[PDB]
């Protein structure tokens, strides 16, 4: 509200800056202290600040993460919020926005001087508007105030012609009718800073680690936490992160990428169930995915029926996931040797070996091809249903009530779909 108090604050801040640089330098000779006190205490320091602002720029999407030899145009832009649903971006970033700094790594003092909150809010909005409190505390003359204001406000604008370097990415996007646009994207440093803050709070925050310690002792807590597995680290500066940006200096590289991975990204091996009697309980049963599925089915078997429609729906796609994983497991056994089912053994699951190895019919033109064609084994579905009955909780309350009736009906639907899948395997 008063220019006198703003002058008092800025003089105070340059006073701690002066004493800090004198203490750090410890100048006992060469007349360094006199030059420091004659250049960083008056309006001459504001002249140097106006000089240094022209080399720096506040941005929200920088280009320097893309190959650091690329010289392009960095932008400080917030995209408009789309009407289309279910997608994220920079347009969610409102008041929780942090502005990047690009340029020299030694002139960033003017950035923290310009991002001050003296009377309650930032200097940027004060210098954009014609505020009586501002525009006079920094200059006694009007022309000096005007030139310093234009200098300190142009730091958020695009400097130079719009250019994206050769090392930067430019990606054609086909227009709906016979056209293309070039779409040079910039690295959203504001988004990765916001997600870095969120992930740092989730993985190293005080409440988060308190919840982790509560789970470690298996006790209750008013809130839970998150785990964030399979995070990837992409560093931008090999040894000098400050050459990219100040936000990339706060987090030294460390893009903290999220795991967009398919379910088969950790394929272990394929093995033949040789000397075992039933694959679904002996070799199929201890793959980690189906183990998790049957444990979720175990937990959901004994549950309240207040939301019984949603619970039955969830269990329906649950048992659908078990049958899908069974089909996938047979499909990946299809890449084994064609005649592994003919190996000697007392227990080799001959009833299910017709479905486990389709490829045996090629070598055995008359031994087992016609048997598999004519029989069309669908009792494998019955055996897997018996395995699922062995894998469901033995609750008599569900069996007496109609809950077991609904569970048996949805199981019958999933098993008849599964049997129809195994029906046309001879095509």
């Amino acid at each position: 509200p008063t220019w006198q108090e703003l002058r008092q604050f800025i003089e105070s801040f340059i006073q701690e800056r002066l004493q800090g640089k004198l203490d750090k330098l410890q100048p006992d000779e060469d007349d360094k202290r006199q030059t420091l006190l004659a250049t960083h205490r008056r309006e001459a320091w504001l002249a140097d600040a106006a000089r240094r602002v022209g080399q720096l720029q506040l941005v929200t999407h920088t280009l320097k993460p893309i190959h650091p030899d690329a010289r392009g145009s960095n932008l400080h832009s917030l995209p408009q919020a789309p009407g289309q649903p279910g997608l994220a971006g920079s347009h969610e970033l409102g008041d929780r926005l942090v502005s990047d700094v690009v340029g020299n790594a030694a002139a960033l003092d003017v950035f923290k001087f310009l991002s001050l909150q003296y009377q309650g809010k930032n200097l940027l909005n004060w210098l954009t508007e014609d505020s009586a409190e501002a525009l006079q505390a920094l200059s006694d003359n009007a022309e000096q105030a005007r030139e310093w204001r234009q200098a300190f406000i142009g730091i958020t604008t695009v400097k130079g012609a719009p250019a994206s370097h050769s090392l930067a990415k430019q990606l054609y996007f086909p227009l709906p009718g016979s056209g293309y646009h070039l779409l040079a994207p910039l690295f959203p440093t504001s988004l990765v800073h916001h997600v870095h803050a969120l992930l740092r709070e989730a993985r190293f925050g005080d409440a988060a680690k308190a919840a982790r310690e509560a789970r470690s002792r298996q006790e209750s807590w008013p809130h839970g936490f998150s785990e964030y597995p399979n995070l990837a680290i992409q560093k931008f500066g090999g040894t000098k992160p400050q050459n990219i940006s100040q936000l990339n200096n706060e987090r030294r590289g460390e893009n903290w990428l999220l795991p967009s991975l398919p379910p088969n990204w950790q394929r272990q091996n394929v093995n033949a169930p040789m000397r075992h009697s039933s694959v679904f309980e002996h070799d199929f049963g201890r793959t980690p995915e189906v183990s998790r599925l049957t444990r979720t089915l175990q937990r959901f078997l004994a549950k309240t029926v207040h939301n019984n429609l949603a619970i039955r729906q969830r269990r329906a796609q649950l048992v659908a996931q078990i049958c899908d994983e069974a089909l996938q497991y047979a499909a990946r056994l299809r890449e084994l040797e064609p005649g592994w089912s003919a190996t000697p053994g007392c227990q080799l699951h001959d009833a299910e070996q017709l479905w486990l190895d389709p490829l045996r019919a090629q070598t055995d033109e008359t031994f087992l091809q016609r048997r598999l064609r004519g029989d069309w084994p669908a009792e494998v579905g019955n055996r897997f249903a018996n395995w699922l009955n062995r894998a469901v909780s033995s609750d008599s309350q569900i069996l007496g009530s109609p809950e077991a009736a609904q569970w048996s009906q949805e199981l019958s639907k999933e098993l008849t779909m599964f049997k129809e899948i195994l029906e046309d395997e001879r095509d």
Partner: protein
Amino acid sequence: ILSTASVLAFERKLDPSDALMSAGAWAQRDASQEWPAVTVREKSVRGTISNRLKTKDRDPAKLDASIQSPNLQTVDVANLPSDADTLKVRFTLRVLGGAGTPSACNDAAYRDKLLQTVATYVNDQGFAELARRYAHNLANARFLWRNRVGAEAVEVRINHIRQGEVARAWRFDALAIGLRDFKADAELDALAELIASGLSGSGHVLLEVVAFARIGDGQEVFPSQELILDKGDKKGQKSKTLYSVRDAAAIHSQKIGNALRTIDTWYPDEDGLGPIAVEPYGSVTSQGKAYRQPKQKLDFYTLLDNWVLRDEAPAVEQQHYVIANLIRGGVFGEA
């Protein structure tokens, strides 16, 4: 005025796959489709300090104290089995066409002038020398690198795959064909003609290259080592990590490509090294020194700019070097 393009790029022609490593016995190289793969294992090594001291660690007491601390490391190691003496290295190679066509380029007049320059080169002598040198680098086992060093006998079998079958098959003795001399052989000329036809074509020509090196019974083979940055973590890591695709030791595709690119014998320095990999500013990673410096008028950028803009056509060898760089690819262009 024919200003050079601000954005210039070339697609990687002549791109190989990962060299799968497998093991077996010699004189059974024909039935090697079921040879078991070479697996990357783990072993512990305990060494002693053997690096140079910085004139302050040369005190005997400090040296003895540092030796009394055991130096333990975990390394990835790849070995032939104790009953197999032959290492089989197999990879696939695609010789793409449209060799002189840039993938991205701004100026359309620069497009026409560059395509005219490549047309003049191809109808003058074509890819006869370049495909000859590439076929030589295929014929000798230069893509084995350290696996080629102490092998009793190396044989390279190269098959042309047209649809799904061997259209034409080659067999070479890699140790007879030198690593620095590019002679002429009838089968080598046929392979060079096939590679040049692939480079001049509109599609691609597929080759599989299978090399058998008689390393020794149970000896230690050398897959490509993986580049992992320590990034200043406090825990000690494994010092050596080997590359594998599916539980099978392999050599990186760019390693094989660098082996195939070792055709440049026209750099201004003497050929004490022999051929070097075709790169802009003639860099050699093993020698730590970049030949074809821009202070001399023999680097790729100045040669190309003189050839296409000022029409100063260089020597035939330098034209071969420029077109070999076009085969290699790269992201070019000034701001």
